[PDB]
Design a protein around this ligand. Structure first.
Ligand SMILES: [Cd+2]
Ligand SMILES: [Cd+2]
Ligand SMILES: [Cd+2]
Ligand SMILES: [Cd+2]
Length: 31
C-alpha cells in the first residue's frame, strides 16, 4: 500500500507517516 497518490511507493518523504494532506494530485511535503 502506498499512502498517497502524489508520491509513489518509493518516495523519500512518506517513510514516517504520510504527511501529504490538504492537497490532492499534488503535495508540498514531497514536492
Ligand atoms: Cd504524496
Ligand atoms: Cd511522499
Ligand atoms: Cd504518502
Ligand atoms: Cd508530501
Amino acid at each position: 500500500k502506498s499512502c498517497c497518490s502524489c508520491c509513489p511507493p518509493g518516495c523519500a518523504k512518506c517513510a514516517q507517516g504520510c504527511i501529504c494532506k490538504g492537497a490532492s494530485d499534488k503535495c508540498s511535503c514531497c514536492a
